[PDB]
Amino acid sequence: HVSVVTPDGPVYEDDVEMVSVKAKSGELGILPGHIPLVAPLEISAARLKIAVSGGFLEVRPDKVTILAQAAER
Amino acid sequence: FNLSDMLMITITCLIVFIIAVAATRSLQLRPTGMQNFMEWVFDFVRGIINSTGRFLTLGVTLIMYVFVANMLGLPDATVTLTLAVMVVALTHYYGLKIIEEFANTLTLGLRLFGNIYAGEILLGLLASLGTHYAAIPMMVWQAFSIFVGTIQAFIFTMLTMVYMAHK
Amino acid sequence: FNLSDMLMITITCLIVFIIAVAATRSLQLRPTGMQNFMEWVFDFVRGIINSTRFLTLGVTLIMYVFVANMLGLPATVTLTLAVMVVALTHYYGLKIIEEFANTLTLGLRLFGNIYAGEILLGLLASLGTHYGAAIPMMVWQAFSIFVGTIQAFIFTMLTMVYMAHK
Amino acid sequence: FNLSDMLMITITCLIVFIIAVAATRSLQLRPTGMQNFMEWVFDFVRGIINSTGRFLTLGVTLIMYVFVANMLGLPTVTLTLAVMVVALTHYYGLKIIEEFANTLTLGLRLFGNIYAGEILLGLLASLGTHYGAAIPMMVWQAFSIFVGTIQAFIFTMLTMVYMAHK
Amino acid sequence: SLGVLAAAIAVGLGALGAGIGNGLIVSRTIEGIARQPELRPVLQTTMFIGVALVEALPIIGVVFSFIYLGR
Amino acid sequence: SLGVLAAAIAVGLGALGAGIGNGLIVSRTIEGIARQPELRPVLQTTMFIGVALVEALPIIGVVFSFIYLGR
Amino acid sequence: SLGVLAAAIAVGLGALGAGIGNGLIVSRTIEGIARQPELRPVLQTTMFIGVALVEALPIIGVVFSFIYLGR
Amino acid sequence: SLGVLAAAIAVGLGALGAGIGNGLIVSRTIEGIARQPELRPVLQTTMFIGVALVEALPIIGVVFSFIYLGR
Amino acid sequence: SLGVLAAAIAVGLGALGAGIGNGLIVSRTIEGIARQPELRPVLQTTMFIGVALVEALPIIGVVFSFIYLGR
Amino acid sequence: SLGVLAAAIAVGLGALGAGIGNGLIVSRTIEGIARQPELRPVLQTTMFIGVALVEALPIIGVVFSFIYLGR
Amino acid sequence: SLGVLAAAIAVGLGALGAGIGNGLIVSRTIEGIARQPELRPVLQTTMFIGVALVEALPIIGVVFSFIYLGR
Amino acid sequence: SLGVLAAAIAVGLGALGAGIGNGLIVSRTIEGIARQPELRPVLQTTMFIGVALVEALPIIGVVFSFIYLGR
Amino acid sequence: SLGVLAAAIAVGLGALGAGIGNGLIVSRTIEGIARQPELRPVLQTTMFIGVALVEALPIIGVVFSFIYLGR
Amino acid sequence: SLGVLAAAIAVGLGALGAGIGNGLIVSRTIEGIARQPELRPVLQTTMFIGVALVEALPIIGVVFSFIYLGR
Amino acid sequence: RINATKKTSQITKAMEMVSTSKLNRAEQNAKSFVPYMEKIQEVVANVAHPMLVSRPVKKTGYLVITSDRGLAGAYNSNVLRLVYQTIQKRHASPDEYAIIVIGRVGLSFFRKRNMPVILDITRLPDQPSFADIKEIARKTVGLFADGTFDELYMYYNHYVSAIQQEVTERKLLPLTDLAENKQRTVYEFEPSQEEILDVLLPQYAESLIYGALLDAKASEHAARMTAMKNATDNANELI
Amino acid sequence: IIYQLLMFIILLALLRKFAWQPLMNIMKQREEHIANEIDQAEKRRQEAEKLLE
Amino acid sequence: SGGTIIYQLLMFIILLALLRKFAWQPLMNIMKQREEHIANEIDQAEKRRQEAEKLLEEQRELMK
Amino acid sequence: TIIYQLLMFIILLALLRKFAWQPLMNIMKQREEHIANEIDQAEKRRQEAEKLLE
Amino acid sequence: GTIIYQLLMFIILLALLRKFAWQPLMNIMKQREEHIANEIDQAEKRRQEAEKLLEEQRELMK
Amino acid sequence: SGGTIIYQLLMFIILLALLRKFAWQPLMNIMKQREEHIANEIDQAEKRRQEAEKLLEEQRELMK
Amino acid sequence: SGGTIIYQLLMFIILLALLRKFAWQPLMNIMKQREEHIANEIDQAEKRRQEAEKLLE
């Protein structure tokens, strides 16, 4: 699951086999089975295979959730 | 002069001639066969130039020439030095720092020549060992020497493009 | 045979025997003094074994090597001890050659550590007698004793892990 | 005695005296020109002392004298100065001999920097005279003077740190 | 006959330096491509140009060693 | 005479450099696979090309050392 | 006859080059083991293949040193 | 004789390599233990296996050095 | 006689320094580029000032070595 | 006759390797201690274990130097 | 006699040191410029003074080597 | 004759090994102080203890160097 | 009489050590200023005091080398 | 005789070791100061403590080298 | 008289029904807001600095919650009374009497009492969105970060039952009471922990500023509905 | 340098010039296919708008 | 060395044949992938134009 | 010398074991058994008391 | 002379180390013994309290 | 009396002229900035004193 | 070595004392007087402001 969550509510909760995202430290390519880590987003348009405008990125080998506010498809 | 070197240079010129003629023998809308490979290599050099139009022409000619130069060695320093000098002069005319840059260009040409001579020396040592007396090791040596020559040609083209862009 | 080595071995065995007798002079539910020290060495060796049947063998080996290193304060034996330990580990249960060399290397390392300490102490004592560095001599003896204690612990741990692997 | 060294020391002393006289020719609430430079250097040394009052005057004179010595070279004493500085630092308030060794090493390092600069300048001048790299010679004098200045400030900072530690 | 020894020493030094440089570069680009797979073409291109630049000097060293051995 | 020792030192330095090279190389690719388990074959192939690329020069050095020893 | 010197220095250089390589190899493997224990078999296999690859040139150097000592 | 110097050089090189490798191993084990405080057993077994493989070469080097010194 | 050996050691040390320099440079730049995929041209430019600054001295060393070998 | 310098280089190399190993050991263990104030006795005990492990080859090298000097 | 070898050794060691220093300096400036591009000018300047600082002893070494060769 | 040269270099690498050794010992000390100042005393005890073993091997060399000088 | 050779060797070793030291110091302060532009004056004053501190001893080494060359 | 060469070798090795040690010891300090600027006084305390400990070996080494040169 | 009281009862009952419908509408958002809070709490607990420790206090801001319109029983009055009592008790100095208001009635009361309003916001919809409060939350958190105050507090009513609107208080002060999660999982940091925490802390603060206000809106709607039902019954029995 | 100049002039001239002339016959055709498709799509959209009107 | 040169040429020819025996498939696959990409790029535009024309005809018929 | 040393070491180890280590192990096992018996008695008494109260 | 000098040095070292090592070793041994005794008498007191509670519960039920 | 001293003096003179022509402004503006800061502090103090005196006089006049 | 170390130390001490008593005491005294004058001006301004406030009250 690559479900994103906003204070108003969820937006998308589909499954995926590829994740890409631009973070403040740099670009990241996330794959299933990745080590848990934390990285902050900086007004980036995350792409799966939507916009975030400020938020946090957490990864778990099971699933990845991108919590942020003001996110639209 | 060097009669053998002149004959070899003429041989590479003729080889490039027939290769280009065969590549552009027929014109159509869908490049296939040799035309497909020509389109692919043209796209590759165009992308390299964009990363680092007018100069893509002689860039392609130089790439093909060094490819042929690496090619016939499988079966010279003056030529490499002259080519490096001509490339440096063309880059300067297109537009101790200058002396240093010329030294680096000469060093790059000498490095390509040294790779060629390293391959030649390995082949000669293998031939001498055969005369004294390794088909698979000879095959591996020929393969990786041709591979290294191709990468050296690509690196020389990229360095020339970078120097031209800087100038 | 080596008369001096035999005498030293006999002295170390006697010292270990009297130490064990004094530690086990009496038994009770409250260990104090020497009994407390024996309890704490037993707990430490048990914890080491658990981290890495042979507990009493390890305790006896630790006591023997500690007494041997302490006696030096005032190579054949080390090789024999290493060979016996390797044989016991093998019987309890290229690459084999390297594994066999490793135990001899550990034994030789312990032997060389004690030999270097003894040689340095003897040279310093002879130099001081001929022409008195009491503080540096005491520091050197304390450093050698500490190094021997760490070497004894390392040898015990190495024997334990080798036995566990075997 | 060293007549040339004594004459050079007297020359630097006279230069320092006349520089101080020019700097303190007049006193008021508005520092300008030479007074502006004197105020700037006084503020800099005061800030350095605060980072690392009573010894501020000594620091000012030592900095001025070492700057004059570096400037003069453009056209034993160092050991004596280092010994005097170490003695003053000790009297203000193997560790002691180690600290004396570091002080002597710092003095010898400054001396070696000046000596190497002078030797290089002399060799370059002799080579140019015999068979004239005016621009490289000027560059050489430039960074030799610059390095001497940084060495002077480094020595002042080290002396201040030693005095604070003492 | 010390020229042979001199040439061998130069060749060995050049080989060690080239090995160190190539190891550093390719080890770093391994993590470079491991962090984000999508950049592989660019990373491999700069990979190859960098290793060529690194190996440039060792070829000159080998040529000089051969010349010295011949002399 | 000295050619044998010249070849010996040449091969020794070549081997030392190559060893540092592939050691760094394997350490970095192992860190990479630890980072992202899903890229195992591509990391393996990149390390496989890299080791040959770095080790190319020491083989030439060894060949030159053998030639010198023969001389 | 410095053949003994040549062989010994070659062997020493080979061992010195090898050891640092193997250690730097296994260090990152144990780091990955600490980071994510679930991949112990694959990191073990990669470790062993890395050490096997690294300890190749020193072996050839050792045999060459033995040959040189014989000669 | 000269063979004594050769053997000493080989022994020194082997000792330096083994020290570097095993120091790196034990430092990385300390780092791993600090990172994860409950993996001490497996970390220790990996430590011992790593130092064993690292020091494998030095023993053979010492044996060859002794043989050369005897020669 | 000794002049050729002096020249050889000079060029060898120069090659060592040069290679280590630009290898470290291009490795760190690969890491930075993989960190930030964009802004490639500025780093690709700084490549060559860095390499020239690193390699300035060894060319003078090689020239001096050739001069000494002449004597 | 000339075994004195052999013994000297042996002890010097052994000491240098031991120093590097110990420096790495203490650096990493105190870094871990700073990272986590607890488990201090565990860290110290493991660091002494590592020190005893590393100080193995140099001692044997010193003994070898002693017997070589005797010869 | 030995003056040529002395000058070559001095020049080579100076080149090695200068290469190391410049390599580290411009590699870290590339790292910083990749971190934040805004301060590009001040990093370039500071790296200018850094290069000037590091490349000071090798010049004196070259001058002393020339003097010794003359002697 | 050569003993004085042997003895002088015996303390040579020992000083180099000790200096290169404890250099990393104190660099990590400040890192813990910078990360956390409340643990200043506990870090100082470890570093003071650690440097003793770092310089332990060179102490064996210098005394042995004096013996070599006498012979 | 090899005195010039000894002096040049000492000068070269000092130059290499100084080069490494200034490279490390100035690279670290470059990283610092890139991290935090605000502390620039403090970073530069620490830069100069540190570079003077490290370069101190090689100056004494060069002076001793000149003395030995004279002798 | 050889005493001058021995003394110069000892001085050079000690200088290289001291320079490397001082550079490594001081490198992290700029980063620490940039991270917390408030710990400036205690950071200078650990500046001037331990640097003398590192440099103590070079001073004794050069003193012994001067003694050997005096012979 | 009869017609007037009948009309008043009718209109009061109708708008009480509207209030109940608004309560029902707000309950959906209150129930749907949880997952963001759960995720951020888990992440903060896993990961864990200026705003993480206390300091020598010098001033304290007092956030309060009220309603744009009145016509409530105790919602806009109990919080004001409690806040005034605790202020007059603790914050003896006017410098420490710093306050922040969000409701029109509270604004009027504090203007009458002559209190130093620092920042204020009014004219908010019945069901607000994030962007309408984000600016105020960012301003307050930036003020706290720069250090104008040294302690933060919120006063409001928490919805526990339709007829029971309990009043309570929380602490937006430097974070101390963090509930450690049972499954403590250790993550890595790409841009390092210092920057990670420095970026996450304002996110947590401006998320904690929510939840409380949703509960306050639900409580005020419940109080309105209950008071108007009581008034309607009183009018019916009087008629 | 005369023979090298002749060879390089030929390589930059004549042969490669004609080859670049023929490669255009494929590249421009491939581009013009998409260009004509886009133009036809625009014409069809205009026809649809006219039908809507 | 006429015989050595001939032997080297024969060995190089055999090496080229052996390398081709394993490298003919990958290079041909890469060329086929490029050709398929170009063909798909052309066919997408052709299909889009045809669909637009058909939609225009349908809209005109509906309008009539 | 090696064979005699090994035989003496083996004999001394066996004698020390069978003389004190077996008695020392017996004493340690007795202490552990006493502690375990006390713990088991406490647990049984607590369980019986809880059952009686319930 | 050398043997007696070494013996005197060893005796002086033991005397010096006695004062610096008696306190730490004795403190550690005392702490270990105190922990063991704490475990033992905690178990004994828990057993006695359990027996007393059982007797009290039986009396209360009776 | 060799020409080395004269050559060194000429080189020093040329270096001094170049250094002056290339660095007169950087030192001059720094000195002027320090002097301007001191003058600004003095003028601020004087203006504050004058304003305080004027305010006291105005308050006295208003009271009277 | 030499015998000018004592003379150099005596000259340094004499130069220190003479430079101090000739310029350093006057320059430091002038700087202290300027600082004290600035402080006195600030204090006088504060006193004038306090007097103005008292007169207003």
Residue numbers in the entry:
A (entry chain E): 5 to 53, 61 to 84
B (entry chain C): 15 to 66, 73 to 95, 112 to 131, 154 to 191, 199 to 232
C (entry chain A): 15 to 66, 74 to 95, 113 to 131, 154 to 191, 198 to 232
D (entry chain B): 15 to 66, 73 to 95, 114 to 131, 154 to 191, 198 to 232
E (entry chain P), F (entry chain Q), G (entry chain R), H (entry chain S), I (entry chain O), J (entry chain T), ...: 2 to 72
O (entry chain D): 10 to 57, 65 to 255
P (entry chain I): 11 to 63
Q (entry chain H), T (entry chain J): 7 to 70
Structure paper excerpt:
FoF1-ATP synthase (FoF1) is a ubiquitous enzyme found in the membranes of mitochondria, chloroplasts and bacteria. It synthesizes ATP from ADP and inorganic phosphate (Pi) coupled with proton translocation across membranes along the proton motive force (pmf). Therefore, we designed the δΔN-α fusion construct of Bacillus PS3 FoF1, where the C-terminus of the δ subunit was genetically fused to the N-terminus of the α subunit.
Because of the lower resolution of the Fo region, focused refinement with Fo was conducted by masking the Fo region. The refined structure achieved resolutions of 3.5–6.6 Å, confirming that the peripheral stalk always accompanies Fo a-subunits. As a result, the three a-subunits were not positioned exactly 120° apart from each other. The spatial intervals between the a-subunits are not perfectly symmetric because of the symmetry mismatch between the ring structures of F1 and Fo, that is, threefold versus tenfold. This suggests that all a-subunits are functional, which is consistent with the aforementioned biochemical analyses showing the enhanced H+/ATP ratio. The structure of the triple-stalk FoF1 clearly showed that the c10 ring can accommodate up to three a-subunits, but not more than four due to spatial constraints.
